[PDB]
Design a protein around this ligand. Structure first.
Ligand code: ATP
Ligand code: DCL
Ligand code: MG
Ligand code: MG
Ligand code: ZN
Length: 862
């Protein structure tokens, strides 16, 4: 065994040894239980950084742990190669989108392979190749036939910098998720996935996700934004139906999320476009002056009345500016004693306020809005007839019973969520499989003629959709009539691919469907998913929707894609930038910046070392490829070795917690790896290997007994930490503690060396998921078997039994007590414990003499 710890020697070798054994290349093996552990795959938007190390070392640790426990482990990796992140990274580097993506993919494969991750590279996938995206083209056409995908004009979010429309999930604080520019409103046709159709299931199936962080689940609940309301009809009075036709003559329909207040409505409000507004203004020009005014909070009375269904009150109808014709009903009711928006409006014109809710008994002031009025949680109903005394839940159902039995209403559910707009005016994206024919309409491309192949030799000129200036691409024949027609030039958003790729990993070479039935039946769902919480509202919602879509088609048979979700905390570091002449920002790596400090130690100035000219200091921020603040793992592997990169990131903090970059933390992770190497080498220099201690330990010294206790305690604690707590920093700390006691333990005797062997064989296996290169090498110097067949270390709980004795206690001869003591518990602690529990102190004045038998009995004399 060499004595210097040289990563560049042992690390490539260990990777070659794992690769040759094909340990990470798994198939649908029914003899082993399956474990699908997946980390969120990267965009080719630059170099990987130490945040990615943390992300994927977490995954690798969980996979390697389950592999050592006999599981059949699939840990795949691929590339989110389509869409905006790879294209923008390509144009900022003035490279063709295809050329850049394929080059960055190979650099990221190089970067990841130097880290020794146990990845099944035979399932590698690049979402920009036709053999991938043809299958989402196929799913598009099928859904389009059913109308689950549809095209429609409407108001959309427009990113002026990326020159494309985004989905509502791609707008972050009114700005583009990639550009950061303010989003404008525009009316553009778009292809939508009808995600509102699945709004109820996506909300209710979050209750199934017991191993998801509750933040992700509540954030998706608030994004789906469910509200249970009530459709309510107020009949038009027998003397206001002038000019009204159809249903608009007989009733005024409104919506309300507070149907419990219905007995308190004192007037209604109507839209200028609502038909009762037009017949009321037909002979009243001042009403048409308001109808022309907007079409702030203003309103006019109309003198036409509608009847409350629940008590027969005749309420006056108001033209109001806050009733946007597009409400669904275009009209509301107004309970001003319990809605702030309505109390303000009905103080503007002195309308009445009847109170119908009491909270405990907060006194009711008619012209003084108190916050308890809108309490939908701690209130019971007042002045409401047989609805008196009900709470909000019970009064909801009772109003629905009332309204439905007379037909005047019914519950109606609304969602803040809107359909998913996936069209993009961009080149580097999966082509949309539609052909517009002047005779047949928007027709899908037949399954036999898929994929519609995106040409890869294009460079965007940065001036609109490049495919739309390419008649060689869009001029085609109609699939239905043979006539001339044009291809859809918009492409699919990048979140299409990432919504199903976890299935593609199960059969990436399958050429007849999205995923083959035999492999989807085997791999089931992703057992473990690891990725940042920033995906809560977009990807982690999209992927549940797609999974349900694929299930309803018969491709998969799971309801949810990811059983366990671990959201790792962000590695953060400094970030700098300049402002470019295009109004944007040019981000700069802290390694190209030279700082100037204050007298107190604060950075004051920062200049780029290339030109000495200043740069702006942006402060600590998440390590990001798009903000050019990453620490490259290859620059650490070359200097310190891959294991040090891995050990530092699993040790600095618990996986969920924020981690700040520091050079001290890298040196420390290395000195421990030297300590591990030095420990195994020194043990081997003074004797060589021996058969690890096992079996009964009667006869071992107390000191080595204590060590075996520390040993199997640690194995138990590391096992609990990998596979229940999923806390890796504390698994590493426990092994250090084990090594601390080993350093303090004389292990030179024949039995001591057998215990040293047992400890070291255990330690390197315990740390193999975290630092596999150094452990695999050390294991081979200690033991000739294959590490992954020796398996995960077992806890020998015989070694956990404490070394104790139970001595007799007597008073003047006759036995009256029994006490527990340590093995080497001195006669003073013995005699003190003997004269300190029941039998001796209840039959005792002090003792005249205490004769002690060494480790047998102690007799009190009185
Ligand atoms: N600083 C970081 N710390 C921890 N995890 C990170 C960090 N940056 C990215 N990740 C995670 O790595 C995975 C891949 O992210 P991605 O490919 O978007 O890289 P990125 O650094 O975010 O690049 P970009 O800024 O262009 O999006 C995701 O699970 C993401 O949450
Ligand atoms: C699963 C995907 C949405 C993750 C992206 N490729 C990186 O954030
Ligand atoms: Mg990202
Ligand atoms: Mg369950
Ligand atoms: Zn046609």
């Amino acid at each position: 065994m060499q004595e210097h710890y040289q990563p560049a020697a042992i690390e490539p070798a260990a990777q070659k040894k794992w690769d040759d054994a094909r340990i990470s290349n798994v198939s649908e093996d029914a003899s082993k239980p399956k474990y699908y552990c997946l980390s969120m795959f990267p965009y080719p938007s630059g170099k990987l950084h130490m945040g990615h190390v943390r992300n994927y070392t977490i995954g690798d640790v969980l996979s390697r742990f389950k592999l050592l426990n006999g599981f059949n482990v699939m840990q795949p990796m691929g590339w989110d190669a389509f869409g905006m992140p790879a294209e923008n990274a390509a144009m900022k580097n003035n490279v063709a989108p295809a050329a850049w993506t394929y080059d960055n993919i190979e650099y990221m494969k190089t970067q990841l392979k130097s880290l020794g991750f146990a990845v099944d590279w035979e399932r590698e996938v690049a979402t920009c190749k036709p053999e991938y995206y043809r299958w989402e083209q196929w799913l598009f056409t099928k859904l389009f036939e059913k109308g689950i995908v549809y095209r429609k004009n409407g108001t959309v979010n427009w990113d002026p910098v990326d020159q494309t429309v985004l989905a509502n999930e791609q707008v972050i604080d009114g700005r583009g998720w990639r550009s950061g520019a303010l989003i404008e409103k525009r009316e553009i046709p778009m292809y939508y996935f009808k995600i509102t159709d699945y709004a109820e299931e996506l909300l209710n199936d979050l209750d199934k996700l017991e191993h998801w962080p509750e933040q992700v689940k509540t954030m998706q609940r608030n994004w789906i934004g469910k509200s249970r309301g009530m459709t309510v009809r107020f009949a038009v009075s027998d003397d206001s139906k002038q000019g009204l036709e159809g249903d608009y003559a007989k009733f005024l329909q409104v919506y309300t999320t507070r149907p419990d207040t219905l007995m308190g409505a004192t007037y209604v409000a109507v839209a200028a476009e609502h038909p009762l507004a037009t017949a009321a203004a037909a002979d009243k020009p001042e009403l048409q002056a308001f109808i022309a005014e907007c079409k702030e909070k203003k309103g006019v009375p109309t003198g036409r009345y509608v009847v409350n269904p629940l008590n027969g009150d005749k309420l006056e109808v108001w033209i109001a500016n806050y009733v946007l014709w597009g409400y669904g009903d275009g009209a509301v009711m107004a309970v001003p004693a319990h809605d702030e928006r309505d109390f303000e409006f009905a103080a503007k014109y002195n309308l009445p306020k009847k109170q119908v809710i009491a909270v405990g008994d907060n006194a009711f002031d008619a012209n003084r809005w108190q916050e308890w009025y809108g309490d939908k949680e701690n209130g019971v109903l007042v002045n409401s007839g047989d609805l008196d005394g009900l709470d909000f839940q019970t009064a909801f159902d009772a109003v629905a019973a009332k309204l439905q039995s007379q037909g005047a209403g019914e519950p109606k559910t609304q969602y803040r969520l809107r359909d998913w707009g996936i069209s993009r005016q961009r080149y580097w994206g999966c082509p949309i499989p539609i052909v517009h024919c002047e005779k047949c309409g928007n027709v899908p491309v037949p399954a036999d003629q898929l994929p519609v192949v995106l040409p890869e030799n294009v460079v965007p000129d940065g001036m609109g959709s490049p495919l739309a200036k390419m008649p060689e691409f869009y001029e085609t024949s109609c699939p239905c009539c043979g006539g001339a027609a044009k291809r859809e030039t918009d492409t699919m958003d990048t979140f299409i691919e990432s919504s199903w790729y976890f299935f593609r990993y199960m059969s990436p070479k399958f050429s007849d469907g999205m995923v083959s039935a035999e492999s989807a039946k085997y791999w089931g769902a992703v057992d473990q998913y690891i990725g940042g919480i920033e995906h809560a509202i977009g990807h982690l919602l999209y992927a549940r929707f797609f999974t349900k879509l694929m299930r309803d088609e018969g491709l998969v048979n799971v309801d949810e894609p990811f059983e366990r979700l671990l959201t790792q905390g962000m590695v953060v570091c400094e970030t700098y930038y300049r402002e470019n002449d295009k109004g944007g920002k040019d981000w700069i790596n802290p390694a190209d910046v030279e700082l100037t400090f204050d007298d107190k130690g604060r950075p004051v100035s920062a200049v780029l070392k290339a030109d000495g000219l200043p740069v702006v200091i942006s402060g600590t921020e998440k390590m990001s490829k798009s903000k050019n603040n990453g620490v490259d793992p290859q620059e650490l592997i070359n200097a310190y070795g891959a294991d040090t990169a891995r050990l530092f990131m699993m040790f600095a903090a618990p996986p969920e917690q924020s981690l700040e970059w520091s050079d001290s933390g890298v040196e420390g992770a290395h000195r421990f790896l030297r300590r591990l190497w030095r420990t195994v080498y020194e043990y081997l220099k003074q004797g060589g290997a021996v058969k690890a201690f096992a079996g009964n330990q009667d006869g071992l010294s107390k000191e080595l007994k204590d060590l075996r206790h520390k040993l199997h305690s640690t194995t138990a604690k590391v096992s609990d930490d990998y596979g229940r707590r999923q806390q890796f920093n504390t698994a590493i700390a426990a092994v250090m503690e084990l090594l601390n006691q080993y350093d303090k333990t004389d292990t030179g005797s024949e039995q001591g060396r057998a215990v040293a062997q047992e400890v070291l064989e255990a330690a390197v296996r315990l740390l193999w998921p975290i630092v596999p290169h150094i452990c695999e090498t050390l294991w081979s110097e200690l033991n000739g078997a294959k590490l992954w067949e020796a398996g995960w270390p077992t806890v020998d709980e015989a070694a956990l039994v404490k070394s104790e004795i139970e001595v007799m206690v007597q008073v003047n001869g006759k036995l009256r007590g029994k006490i527990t003591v340590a093995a080497d518990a001195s006669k003073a602690d013995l005699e003190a414990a003997a004269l300190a529990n029941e039998g001796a102190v209840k039959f005792m004045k002090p003792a005249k003499k205490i004769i002690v038998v060494p480790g047998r009995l102690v007799n009190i004399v009185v």
